[PDB]
Structure 1
Amino acid sequence: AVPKRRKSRSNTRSRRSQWKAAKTELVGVTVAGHAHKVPRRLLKAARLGLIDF
């Protein structure tokens, strides 16, 4: 099985554009000193000081 023809520039860009990463963040993250922001998932570790930058 092979591509019989080139995919038009339009459709190739549509498929290429349907390739993205997710966005997750949290504000109001209180740790020792500066309130560095993390994601919710690792918030508990941040409260325990188990992160590094």
Structure 2
Amino acid sequence: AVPKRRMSRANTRSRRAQWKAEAPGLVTVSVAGQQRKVPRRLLKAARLGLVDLD
């Protein structure tokens, strides 16, 4: 099974647009007196100190 014909310009763009990313949802954390943004998943770990803020 090989592609029978060259795929049109419009046809490849429409499918290629579905290969995208997703920006995470960040949440404010007050550790060491400076407000940072971490995902709400890592909320508890940021206050304990288990996560480093590069």
- Considering the TM-score relative to the shorter chain, is it more than 0.5? yes
Unaligned runs of 5+ in 2: none
Percent of pairs with identical residues:
74
Unpaired stretches in structure 1, ≥5 consecutive residues? none
Q: 1:7 maps to what in 2?
A: 7
What is the root-mean-square deviation in Å for CA atoms of aligned residues? Answer: 1.2
Q: Which has the higher strand share?
A: 2
Alignment deviations for residues 16-35 of structure 1 (CA, whole Å, 9 cap, x no partner): 11111112222322212211
Q: Report deviation, 1:42.
A: 0.8
Count of residues in correspondence between the two structures: 53
What TM-score comes out, normalization by structure 2 length? Answer: 0.82
